[PDB]
Amino acid sequence: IQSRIREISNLALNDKEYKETVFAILLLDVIGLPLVRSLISDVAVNEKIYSAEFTENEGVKNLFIISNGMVKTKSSTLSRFLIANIFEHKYVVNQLLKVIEHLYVINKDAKDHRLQTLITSLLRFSIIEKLLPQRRVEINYFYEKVKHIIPNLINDPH
Amino acid sequence: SISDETYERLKRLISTGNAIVFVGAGFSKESINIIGSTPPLAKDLALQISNKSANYLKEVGADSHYIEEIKQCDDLMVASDFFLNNIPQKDELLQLLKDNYTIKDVTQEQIDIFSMKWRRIYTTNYDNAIELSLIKSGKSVTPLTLEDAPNQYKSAEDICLHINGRIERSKESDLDSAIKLTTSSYLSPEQFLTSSWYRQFKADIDNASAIVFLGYSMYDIDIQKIFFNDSSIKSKTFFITREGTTKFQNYKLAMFGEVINIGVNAFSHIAAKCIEESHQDKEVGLINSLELYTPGEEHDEIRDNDIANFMIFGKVSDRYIDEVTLNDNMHDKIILREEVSKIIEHIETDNDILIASDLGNGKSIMTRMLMSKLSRKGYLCFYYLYNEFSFSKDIERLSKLGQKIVIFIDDYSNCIDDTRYAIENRKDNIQLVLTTRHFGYENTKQHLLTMDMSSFKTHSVDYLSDSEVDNFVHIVDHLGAWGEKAGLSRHEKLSELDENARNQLSFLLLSILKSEAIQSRIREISNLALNDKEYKETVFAILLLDVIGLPLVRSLISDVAVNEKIYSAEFTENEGVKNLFIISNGMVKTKSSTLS
Amino acid sequence: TTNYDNAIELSLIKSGKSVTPLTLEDAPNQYKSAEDICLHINGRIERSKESDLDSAIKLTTSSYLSPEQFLTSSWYRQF
Amino acid sequence: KADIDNASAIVFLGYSMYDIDIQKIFFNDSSIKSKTFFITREGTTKFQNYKLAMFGEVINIGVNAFSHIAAKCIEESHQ
Numbered sequence: 023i024q025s026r027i028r029e030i031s032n033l034a035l036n037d038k039e040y041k042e043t044v045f046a047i048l049l050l051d052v053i054g055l056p057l058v059r060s061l062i063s064d065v066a067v068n069e070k071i072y073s074a075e076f077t078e079n080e081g082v083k084n085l086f087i088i089s090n091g092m093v094k095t096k097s098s099t100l101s102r103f104l105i106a107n108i109f110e111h112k113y114v115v116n117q118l119l120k121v122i123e124h125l126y127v128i129n130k131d132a133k134d135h136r137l138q139t140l141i142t143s144l145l146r147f148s149i150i151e152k153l154l155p156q157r158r159v160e161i162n163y164f165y166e167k168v169k170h171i172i173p174n175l176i177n178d179p180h
Numbered sequence: 181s182i183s184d185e186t187y188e189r190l191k192r193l194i195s196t197g198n199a200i201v202f203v204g205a206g207f208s209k210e211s212i213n214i215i216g217s218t219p220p221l222a223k224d225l226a227l228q229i230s231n232k233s234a235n236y237l238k239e240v241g242a243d244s245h246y247i248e249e250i251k252q253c254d255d256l257m258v259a260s261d262f263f264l265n266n267i268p269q270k271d272e273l274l275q276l277l278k279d280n281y282t283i284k285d286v287t288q289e290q291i292d293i294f295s296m297k298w299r300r301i302y303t304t305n306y307d308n309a310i311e312l313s314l315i316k317s318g319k320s321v322t323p324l325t326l327e328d329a330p331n332q333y334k335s336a337e338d339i340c341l342h343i344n345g346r347i348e349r350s351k352e353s354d355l356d357s358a359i360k361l362t363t364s365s366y367l368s369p370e371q372f373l374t375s376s377w378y379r380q381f382k383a384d385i386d387n388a389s390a391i392v393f394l395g396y397s398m399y400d401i402d403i404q405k406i407f408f409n410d411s412s413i414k415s416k417t418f419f420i421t422r423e424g425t426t427k428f429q430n431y432k433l434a435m436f437g438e439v440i441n442i443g444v445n446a447f448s449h450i451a452a453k454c455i456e457e458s459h460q461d462k463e464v465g466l467i468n469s470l471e472l473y474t475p476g477e478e479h480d481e482i483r484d485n486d487i488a489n490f491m492i493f494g495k496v497s498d499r500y501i502d503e504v505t506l507n508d509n510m511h512d513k514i515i516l517r518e519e520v521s522k523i524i525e526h527i528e529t530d531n532d533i534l535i536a537s538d539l540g541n542g543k544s545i546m547t548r549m550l551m552s553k554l555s556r557k558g559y560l561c562f563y564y565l566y567n568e569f570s571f572s573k574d575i576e577r578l579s580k581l582g583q584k585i586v587i588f589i590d591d592y593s594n595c596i597d598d599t600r601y602a603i604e605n606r607k608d609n610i611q612l613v614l615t616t617r618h619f620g621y622e623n624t625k626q627h628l629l630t631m632d633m634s635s636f637k638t639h640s641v642d643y644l645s646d647s648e649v650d651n652f653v654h655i656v657d658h659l660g661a662w663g664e665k666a667g668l669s670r671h672e673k674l675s676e677l678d679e680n681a682r683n684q685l686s687f688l689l690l691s692i693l694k695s696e697a698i699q700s701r702i703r704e705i706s707n708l709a710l711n712d713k714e715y716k717e718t719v720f721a722i723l724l725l726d727v728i729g730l731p732l733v734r735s736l737i738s739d740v741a742v743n744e745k746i747y748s749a750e751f752t753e754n755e756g757v758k759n760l761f762i763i764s765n766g767m768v769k770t771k772s773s774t775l776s
Numbered sequence: 777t778t779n780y781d782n783a784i785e786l787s788l789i790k791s792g793k794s795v796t797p798l799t800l801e802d803a804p805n806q807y808k809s810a811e812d813i814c815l816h817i818n819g820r821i822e823r824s825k826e827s828d829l830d831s832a833i834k835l836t837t838s839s840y841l842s843p844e845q846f847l848t849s850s851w852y853r854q855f
Numbered sequence: 856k857a858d859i860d861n862a863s864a865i866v867f868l869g870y871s872m873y874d875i876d877i878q879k880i881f882f883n884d885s886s887i888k889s890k891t892f893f894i895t896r897e898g899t900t901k902f903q904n905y906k907l908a909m910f911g912e913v914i915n916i917g918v919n920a921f922s923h924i925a926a927k928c929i930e931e932s933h934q
């Protein structure tokens with residue numbers, strides 16, 4: 023099976039935007055937020071979800087159950103396998119840092135509650151351990167760089 | 181001869197400046213070439229190339245009977261094919277073509293006839309008489325061939341298109357397919373039908389005021405097949421032939437339009453009269469298939485009965501929409517969808533909009549609200565009317581304007597041909613808004629993904645937020661249609677609905693206000709599915725298995741349906757079976773309990 | 777030539793001589809046996825499209841810094 | 856198309872090949888060229904039938920001579 027999943031995932035994850043959007047879908051499903059097109063646009067840091075050619079890809083159709091253009095996951099045992107094995111840890115930590123910076127950067131104006139709870143939910147250790155399982159160096163690097171991305175975190179005991 | 185009323189009709193049609201000329205062999209009969217003579221016809225050229233090949237075979241030393249039987253061969257196609265397939269020196273054939281088809285000087289009638297303003301120029305010549313005649317007369321020209329993409333030259337003018345090729349920058353290998361000389365070239369899979377310029381040619385001869393053929397002998401069969409069928413095209417075309425020709429000689433041409441046997445010489449004088457008026461004419465015309473949306477100018481009172489009509493019975497006026505648009509605090513009269521602002525922000529950045537939704541979840545009303553707001557922002561919004569008038573003429577007249585334009589099309593699956601043309605030949609200052617149901621979108625996926633959809637933003641209005649649920653129940657609270665349920669809180673009220681039907685406007689309307697309009701829509705869609713007894717039995721079996729609660733399985737469905745239609749692949753491609761049961765990978769599941 | 781106009785071509789045509797004008801987007805092997813090569817190094821006007829101003833017609837300060845130039849073309853060896 | 860794909864050989868009896876569609880069918884391929892035989896009239900030079908030679912092998916013997924081949928081959932075809 024793993025070989026089948028790898029072959030059918032390499033047919034979509036080779037593009038940069040497709041990889042970012044797929045990672046955004048997996049990340050928001052991991053946190054538990056609703057999979058809304060406008061919010062997945064902010065998490066994915068592009069607007070490829072609005073194109074009509076995203077939902078007709080091999081990887082997107084073969085890994086996610088699509089229905090009337092919407093995207094939802096198949097099961098947790100495939101999403102967590104994708105997160106652990108198909109996405110490298112070194113990609114995951116860097117993309118997490120990028121989206122954490124960008125959310126704040128565009129949230130300093132709009133003041134949306136969903137972005138705020140997204141940011142304070144990414145900082146929790148349970149999600150990070152569910153995203154980077156038993157990786158000491160990457161977890162340490164992420165925790166030591168999040169305080170330098172945004173300077174208000176030092177005053178927060180959370 | 182040719183009558184005076186035909187003269188007046190021709191002058192009036194050519195003075196518009198939207199005429200199209202088709203140039204043939206007879207136009208450049210008087211020109212002169214590099215070797216200082218009139219360009220030759222097929223007979224002389226065939227004799228020359230046969231003589232050349234026979235001289236080569238005499239040099240190699242073949243029998244004299246073969247030479248004497250090849251020399252008298254005056255068929256251009258067979259002689260050229262034999263030369264290219266047996267004789268190895270094709271460089272001198274290309275040199276002979278360049279010598280014979282390079283015009284050095286033109287006459288004055290050609291200058292006067294090509295100093296007009298046309299829509300587009302089409303020709304079947306090899307020479308450069310037309311390009312020389314356009315420069316000399318004070319106008320630019322960019323020639324092309326069938327091997328050029330028309331989308332790159334969209335904004336260019338003075339497009340002189342050569343159909344059977346050109347010799348000006350022809351290479352050695354172009355004789356096989358590009359230049360239509362041999363029998364092998366005419367049989368190639370690459371022809372005028374397969375080229376992308378064919379659709380452009382059809383649109384041009386559909387859109388033009390009149391079409392003029394200059395000395396065309398009507399040899400090609402594809403143009404004959406284009407022009408034979410229709411009659412509205414025949415009423416616009418004209419043919420120009422040489423003098424001293426009887427009607428029976430022009431009988432072949434007469435089946436495709438009027439025949440005027442005066443020659444290019446006499447048409448040059450008409451061109452001399454019409455040149456000054458050709459460049460001046462301009463008219464905004466009238467737009468027939470698209471009505472210009474205009475905002476409200478007066479304040480009308482809104483009465484409860486209007487609230488009841490809009491909420492339940494589906495009847496509303498555009499004055500109501502314009503009134504709820506100007507003031508955003510009036511939540512007791514309309515539901516404010518959050519997608520309108522996103523859609524507006526997308527349309528301000530040169531992006532097309534495609535809206536897809538389920539049955540009756542607020543799509544046409546969203547289109548009307550968008551139309552009302554975008555004119556206030558400063559655009560021009562046109563609503564597509566399902567009329568019998570043309571659409572290419574109207575989009576052309578819209579392009580001739582100079583304002584920012586948004587065009588709205590509702591339920592495009594019923595006008596897929598026009599909606600295609602719209603995405604095929606869209607201009608720079610015209611955006612598109614297309615709305616459709618899910619079934620209509622999925623039935624036309626293969627007709628649209630082949631084009632450029634990178635400029636389209638896809639939106640779905642199927643679901644709302646909890647704030648909009650609160651707004652809806654606030655509207656009903658102001659209406660007071662709860663009855664005995666008004667005492668209970670928010671949670672109790674909607675306790676009888678399913679999770680996903682709660683977040684859809686159609687099921688909310690049917691469950692709370694019992695909108696008859698939605699009932700009529702459901703009856704209309706389900707009638708076309710439940711007409712057959714087999715499908716009726718299968719649908720009733722699915723509903724029975726759901727109200728029991730036991731899971732759905734193909735064998736069980738077939739057992740309780742007293743048939744085997746569930747095994748057929750056409751059961752899940754019906755109208756009602758798709759619009760009433762959500763399907764996924766061929767399986768059938770129901771939407772919600774309040775629908776079943 | 778370096779001009780973008782058609783004076784050379786009109787002069788050749790008016791003197792009883794043919795011409796095949798090209799640019800740097802043509803390969804030399806397809807025109808190996810050709811004669812009267814009027815190669816326009818900078819560009820051409822006669823059938824220029826809208827995208828030819830960026831790199832094909834050398835006029836702007838961006839069309840002089842593009843990776844495609846006279847050196848990297850296939851006509852450099854021929855010249 | 857399927858019949859000329861599955862057959863053993865294709866025989867033309869006095870066909871001048873006037874229609875353009877059979878011409879477009881038979882001109883492209885080369886495997887169909889090996890199985891195609893054209894039967895034309897007697898007393899014809901090679902050139903008089905150069906057009907037919909492009910699509911397959913041509914035999915200038917007529918139906919008159921083909922009758923003898925049919926009479927010699929009939930008893931084997933049914934067997």
Ligand SMILES: Nc1ncnc2c1ncn2[C@@H]1O[C@H](COP(=O)(O)OP(=O)(O)OP(=O)(O)O)[C@@H](O)[C@H]1O
Nearest residue numbers: 490491492494514515539540541542543544545546
């Ligand atoms: N913005 C809105 N605010 C309040 N009610 C609305 C709104 N939009 C739609 N409705 C209600 O929904 C009903 C059906 O909406 P509408 O006719 O626009 O559906 P639709 O999706 O365009 O239809 P169809 O898909 O069948 O073409 C209307 O009669 C109206 O009562």
Ligand SMILES: [Mg+2]
Nearest residue numbers: 543544590591
């Ligand atoms: Mg509608």
